[model samples]
Target: GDVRLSALSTLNYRNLAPGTLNFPEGVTGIYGENGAGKTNLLEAAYLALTGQTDAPRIEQLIQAGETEAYVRADLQQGGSLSIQEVGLGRGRRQLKVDGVRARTGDLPRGGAVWIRPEDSELVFGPPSGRRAYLDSLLSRLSARYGEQLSRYERTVSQRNAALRGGEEWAMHVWDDVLLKLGTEIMLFRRRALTRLDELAREANAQLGSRKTLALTLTESTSPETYAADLRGRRAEELARGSTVTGPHRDDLLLTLGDFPASDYASRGEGRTVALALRRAELELLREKFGEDPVLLLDDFTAELDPHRRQYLLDLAASVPQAIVTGTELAPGAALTLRAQAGRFTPVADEEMQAEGTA
Candidate 1:
C-alpha cells in the first residue's frame, strides 16, 4: 500500500492564503505564472508532511505582518487515517500528529522527496552544498548518524578552541574523542556511499548519460589515517586554529567520465546528475520505508533539457502521489489546479478543454 497526502491546509504561511487543498492520487499539477504561490503551496505541504524546512529563518515562513503560521496534513497511510500538523512563529516550529504533540523524528521521515531546480547546486556549488545534501539525507535515514555527527561537530568546535594558545598536551585528549567519532562517521559514509553509487550510476545511465557517473566521498582524512594526520597536522591546526582534516570538511565527489562533474559538466550534464541523485534519493527512501513517498517537484519543465523535463513529468505520473508545479499544466494529471496569488482553484474541465482546443 502507498502513503497518500489526502489534504493540506495552510494558514499565513509565506505568501500562501488560508485554505485547504485536497489532493488526489497520482499527479496533481499546479500551473501558474511566477510568484503565483505555486512553490509556497508545495513548501507548506512539504513542511506539514515532513516537519522539515530549510528556511534560514523561521519567521520568514510566517506571512508578513503575521505572528504565526500553521499547516496540517491529512494522510492516508497503511489503510488508516493520519494527521500531521505544524505551527511556526517566534522563531519556533511546533509539530503535532493526530492532535498529539510530536517531535520532528516522530513524523515519518520518508514522507516526501522534494526535487527542485536549485538541486543543481549539489553538482556545481561548493563542497558545503553536497555536504548538506548528504548530511540531511543520511540523517533522515539513520538517526544514529545525525546524533554522532552533531556530537562530532561539537567535539571539533571544542578541540579548535583548545588548539589556540593552549598547552599541546591538552589537545591530545580531545583528539581521542574526535578520532573515535570521526572514524564512525567516515565508516558510515563509506557504507552508505556504496549503495548510493550503485543507485546513482543506474539512474544516470537511464537518464541518457553517455559516460559512467560515479559518486564517492572525497574525505579530507580517512578513519585509518586520522591518527597520523591529527599528530602530523598539529602545527597547521594550531596555526589555523581549526581541525584541518575530518568529517567537518569531507565532500561528496561527483565524477563523470574520469573528470569531476563540478569542474567539467555542461549545464545539461549537471542537471542530469542532479536529477539522478534525486531519483536515487527517492528510491533509497522507498527501500527504507517500504512504501512510495509523496513526491514534490518544483518547476518541473524549466531550466532543464526538454528530455529531462519530460522525464520528470513521466516520473511524477509513475509515482503514487506527486504534486508538480510549472508555468504549464502537466499533461494527464489526475487533478489540475490553477495557482494565482497564493490561492489554488481547480481548473474547470471546460476551460481545460478550450485551452487545449485553442
Candidate 2:
C-alpha cells in the first residue's frame, strides 16, 4: 500500500551495469549463479530508494577504477510519481529529491526492508550490531530520536574529551547533560520495546521455534538513578579516562527459553532468530506507516531449511511488491529474470517455469 519502486536505475555502481530495471507490483525474482551481481542490483535499489547504506566506505560502492557512482529510484506513491537519487564518490554522498538537493533524512521514510544471509550475525555477533539494528529502526520511526541521538553522541564525545583532559571540575556539567539526553533515549527504548518484544516473539513462533523468544533492553543505568550512578562512578570514570556507564554500554538481550541466544543457540537456530527479528522489523514498519514497505530478499534461502524456505516464499508473496534474488529460482514469482554479468533478462516461459515443471 505504500509507495513502491516502479523502476531502478544504476550507473557505475558496484558490479551493476548502467541501465534501468523495471519492477512489477508483485514478486520479481532475479536468479543467477554466484558472482552474477544479483545482490548488487538489490543494494542499488535500496540505496536509491532509502538513501541508506551500511557500507564502511562510500568508495566501496563504486565500481573499480570509477570515480563516481549514481542510483535513482522512480517511485509510485498514492497516484503520484517522484524520483530519489543518490550520488557517491570520493567519500562523499549527495542526495536529491525530485532534482532538489536534500539530506539523507529527507528521503521517504519506511520505504523498504532488506533481508540478507548475514543477518544471522545480529544473533551471535557482538552487542553493537544488535544496538545498531534497534537504533537505526527507532531513528526511522521518529525523526526527533534521530536528532536527539546526534546531540547525545556529540555530548558523549565532548564529555569523553573533558574526562581525558583531567577536567574533574567539569564532571558535573557533563553528567547533567548526559542525564537529560540519555534519559530520553532510555525511556523511548523502553516504551518501544514492548511492542517490538511482542512482534518478535510472535514471529519466532511462526518461524517454528518451539521455545519462546524474549526481547529485553539491558540498561546500564535507570533514568531515576542515572545521575547518582554517574556521580558514584566518577572516580572510576576518571581513572579510565572514559565515560563508563550510560546507554552507550547497553545491550538488547535476546533470550530463547531460559538462556541468552548468543550463548546458547546453534548456528541454524541463530539464523532463524535473525529471520524472526527481521520479520518483526517488517511488520513494525507496516504498522507504523499504514502500508507494506517494499521487500528486498537477497539469497534468503541460503542455509535455511525447507520449512523455513517455504515460510520466506509465503512472506514474499503476501507483500504488494518484493525483489528476491538467489542462485536458484524462487517459486511463483510474477516475473523471473535471468541475471548474468550485471544484466537481467526475462526468462522464457519454459525457463521461468523450469522449477515448477521439473
Candidate 3:
C-alpha cells in the first residue's frame, strides 16, 4: 500500500494540550466550531509529519505566550527506505530514524496532506498565492527542484538588483543562469499540473457542486515565447528594476465555470474550491511520492451547510487516515475527541462501548 496509517497524538500543541490520537486506516474526522483549535491541531500535524507549515506568515504559528511549540509524527518506512519519526519544533525541525538525526529530504517525501479554508485565495488572490501552492508541492516532489528554485530565486533577486544599478552586462549573465534553472522549474510545474488539474476537476465534481471548476497555467512566460517575451519586455523589466516576465509572476488560474473565483465566487463556493484544491494536492503527492500523506481536515464543519458538510465528511471517510477537528465531535470518525482551550479529551463513552465495558 502507498498509504501509511499515521498515529498523530499531540502534547502542548497550540490549541491542543496533552492528548494522543490513534487513527484507523481511512478517514478520521475532527469536527468543531470556530476557536476550537481545530486548525491549530492540523498545523501542528503538518509541521510534525512534513517539517512544514505552509502558513503565509511565520508569526501566525506562534502561540499566545509560548517561546516554542512542537509536534511529532511516527511513520512506517518501506520501499527502498528505513526511517521512523519526523519531529517539528519552533525555530527547528528535524527528521530522525530510530533515534538518530537524519536529513529531511532523505525521509519519505510525501507523508502528510492538508486542507484549509484559505486555499480559495490560490485562485482568487494575487498570483503569489497560486505560485506558493505550486512551488511548495513541487519542492516536495523533487528535492532537486527545491534546490533549483532556491538558486533561481536568488539569481532573480540579484539580477533585479543589478538592473536597479544599471548593470546591463551583468543582467545577461544572470539571465542565462535564470533561463536554465527557471526553464526547468517552469517545465516541471507545467508537467505536474497536468495531473493537478485532473485531480482538481475530480474533487470539484465529488463536492457535488454544479458550477464549473477549471485549472489552467497562467504563466508569466511560456517556453515557446520565453526568450522573445523577455527581450520584448526588457525595457519595462529594466524600468521596474525587476524581471517582470517569468514564472515568478505567474498565477495558477482557477476558474469556476465562466467566472473567476477570486472576484465573483461566494464565500461558500470559495471554501468548496479551496477544499477541492487540497484534495487535488493530496492526489498529486500520492502520484509523485508513491505514498498517501496523512490527511488533516480542520474545523471542517464550520460555516459549511449540511450539503457541504457531508461532502467534507465523505472526503474524510475515504482517506487512509485523516485528523478532522471541530467544536463538536465529527459525525464520522475512527476516534472522537472533544477540543477546548487547547486540550483534547477522548469521548469516554465510545471507548467504553468499544471495549464492551459500557
Candidate 4:
C-alpha cells in the first residue's frame, strides 16, 4: 500500500530562497541547468520529510553566507499515513502529523528515497560509504535497530577516545561492549540483506538487463570471532589508537552479475545497478512500513540514455508521489517547475500555451 503526500515548503535553504511547492499524489518534474538549486530542493525535502540525512555534518547543508535554513512538507496524513508536513530548521528537524508534533519513527520508513549522481561513490568510495547505504536502509526497516545503532556508534566514539590515553588493560571493557552491540548489528544486517538481495536482483532484471546484484558483507570479525580477533590485534589496535575489528569495519559488497560493482562495472552499468538499488530501497520501505513512502528523484534525467531514462521515469511513476528533476522538461509530469540559481517557479499552463502558439 502507498500513502498520499502533497507539497513541500522551504525557506532560507541553500540555493532555495523561500517558497512552497504544492505536490499532489503524482509525479512533479523540476528541470533546470546545473547550479539551479534542483538538488538543493531535494535535499531540503529529504531532511524535512524523513528526518534522516547522509550528510556527515549539519553545517554543510546550510546555505553559504546564511546562518540557518528551513524546509517543510505538507503531507496527506490519511490512508496509512504518508508524509504530510516535514519542517527543517537550522540545527533542528521537526515532524508534525495533522499539525501536531509526531514521532518520526512512527512514520513510514519508505517515506522518501533519494538517488544522486554521487551514488556511484557507494561502490567507488571506501567502507564508510557502503556502510552508510546499509545503515540508512536498515533504519527505515526497523526503528529499534536504528536506536541500537546510534548507541553502538556512540560507544565506539567513547571507546576510541579512551584508547587515545594508551590504556591497554581497559581494552577488554571496550571489547566486551563492542562484542555485545556488534553481534546484534551484524545479525540484523545479515537478515536484511536476504530481502535486499532478492529485490535488487529482480530490479536489475527489470531495468532491461540481465545483471544480478549480489549483496554480501565483508566483515572485520564474525560475532563469534570478534573477541579473539580483538585480543589478537591488541598491540596494533592500541598503537593505532583505534578499535580495529568490529561492526564499524564492515563493508557492503556490491556485485553485479559476476562482476564487482566498483572495480568491474562500467559507469553506465554502475548507474543501472544504483538505480535498481534505489528502487529496491523504495520497495523495502513499503514492505516494512505497510505504506509506500514519498520518492524524490533529483536531476533524474541527467546524462541518461533513452533506455535508462525510461527506466528511471517508469520507476518514479510506480510510486505514489515523486518529485523528479532534470535540465529540460519531463514528459507526463503532473507539475513542472522551472529552476534558477537556487530559486524555483512553476511552469504555468500559459507558459506552455504561449510556446505552443508561437
Give the alpha-carbon lDDT of every model: 0.86, 0.85, 0.71, 0.77
lDDT, candidate 3, 44-138, per-residue tens: 77776666666655445555576554455555443333334544345555567546886556656576777776666665688777888888788
Predict model 3's lDDT versus the native. 0.71
Name the best candidate (by lDDT): 1
Q: Which regions of candidate 4 deviate over 4 angstroms? A: 64-66, 79-103, 349-358
Which residue runs does candidate 1 get wrong by more than 4 Å?
161-177, 350-358
Which candidate order results from sorting by TM-score in descending order?
A: 2, 1, 4, 3
Per-residue alpha-carbon lDDT of candidate 4 for residues 57-175, written as tens digits (9 for 90 to 100): 66666667776666666566564434445444466656665667776676554668898877777767788888888888887777777877888898888778778876656656666
Per-model TM values vs. the true structure? 0.90, 0.91, 0.84, 0.89
lDDT of 2 by residue, 33-70 (tens): 89999998988887886666778899999999999999
Model 3 TM-score, 2 decimals: 0.84
Question: How would you encode candidate 1's per-residue C-alpha lDDT over 233-299 as one tens digit per residue?
Answer: 9888778877797988999999998899999998889999999999998888788878887899999
Look at candidate 4 and tell me the lDDT of residue 1: 35
**Full candidate order by lDDT, most accurate first:** 1, 2, 4, 3
RMSD of each: 3.3, 3.1, 3.4, 3.3
Point out the higher-scoring one by lDDT: 1 or 2: 1
